[PDB]
Symmetry: C3
């Protein structure tokens, strides 16, 4: 099942993201269940916005908000929810919500799947427009959910991203 | 897998429907397999009609036609086949086909996912139009399958719905 | 899971294909993983082409290129990737890439799902156009992947198809 999926083939320059929400899709927020491994409708988003990239998580990891690391992956065409893409971290958007700080990484499809993302080695290689779009999306998607807020601090490099991967792995089962 | 999915987290005002067919979709009738838990093309529908809501079943239940309880869930945007939505029964369309009797329940998305369905407490709260549409759909979808017929008897309340849930759960035992 | 799916319920006039890529879809090449049974993005196709039919494999089989037998299934409407269709082999397109000659079978939806494919008993029953389209697709889809080539030899009958099914079933498990 989707639970039996490797965090990566070779952490952390080579990961597997499990996709929950496709780029440019209807505003349904899906999630994979811990016990079923099934795609659950987590929520119907209230703002009229869409994810600017495919949105998912790395299996066998844990952020300190009590969830796996979240990754945004851009692709030429939207991916099936519940499907897996081998990619390569290239940055992180650092933001804080309530309150367990909520960093989101950005990984691009691995060279084996496509060479279109080879010239993107680090966060600055991403277009400014897409970056502003991601930032703006996370600044606002929850605006119509009372008692929910997000402050976006900023972008950090691929090493920053890789760091969070290794960290959250190991915070990964242990306790 | 999709077999390992709870009937509900608190029957019966709080259930899980496994979605097989999305609202307003192509006329492919999918089903989840008992052994694989895989989404199987059960049939290509012959009439030019679409399901007016997402269509699915409650896991760990059995109707007396030899299938789990079927639930129709309305949502703002169609759901991925094979995905799960936490909802709340609000009624039942009572109908009879060839092989005994074929009640179909109507559950609305749980308040945790959206508050859009909070004012729908019972069957009458659903719009007339949607009700007539469901009824009409089930009256006719099988018209071009010889030796298949459906007579729609009528609508019953949420407690009627809840009843069928509890019943069919327990009848829940025997494959 | 999708791993636990029968090759067929009565080989070889009655098979199960696991669908990876839908007809007329975005050019994402998906695959089912051997360990997870999960839908993995195998590759982003580089040519501006689409699969003319749904594309998938028979579970519990092995071709001599080190993969299950691949089947193309036509349907009236595209199928969900990762879903299973009971169908009935009616032909085979014989082609060579290498490493590993690359026959692709063509099965049509079983009569239980639809009678639309009843009159297609063998390869010649398929329309010319669809045949030329499949052939032309496999001749060219890999044109922009250096060091990859395909020569299409030709079409063979349903018996030829069923043969490859029986062969590749055995060729598997047994070491």
């Amino acid at each position: 099942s989707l639970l039996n999926v490797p965090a990566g083939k070779d952490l952390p320059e080579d990961i597997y993201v499990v996709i929950e929400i496709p780029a440019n899709a209807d505003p349904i927020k899906y999630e994979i269940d811990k016990e079923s491994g099934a795609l659950f409708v987590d929520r119907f988003m209230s703002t009229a916005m869409f994810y600017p990239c495919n949105y998912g998580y790395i299996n066998h990891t844990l952020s300190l908000d009590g969830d796996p690391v979240d990754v945004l992956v851009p692709t030429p065409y939207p991916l099936q929810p519940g499907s897996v893409i081998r990619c390569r971290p290239v940055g992180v958007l650092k933001m804080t919500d309530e309150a367990g700080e909520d960093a989101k990484l950005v990984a691009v499809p691995h060279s084996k799947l496509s060479k279109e993302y080879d010239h993107i080695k680090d966060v600055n290689d991403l277009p400014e427009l897409l970056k502003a779009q991601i930032a703006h999306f996370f600044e606002h998607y929850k605006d119509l959910e009372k008692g929910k807020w997000v402050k976006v601090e900023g972008w950090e490099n691929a090493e920053a991203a890789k760091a969070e991967i290794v960290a959250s792995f190991e915070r990964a089962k242990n306790k």
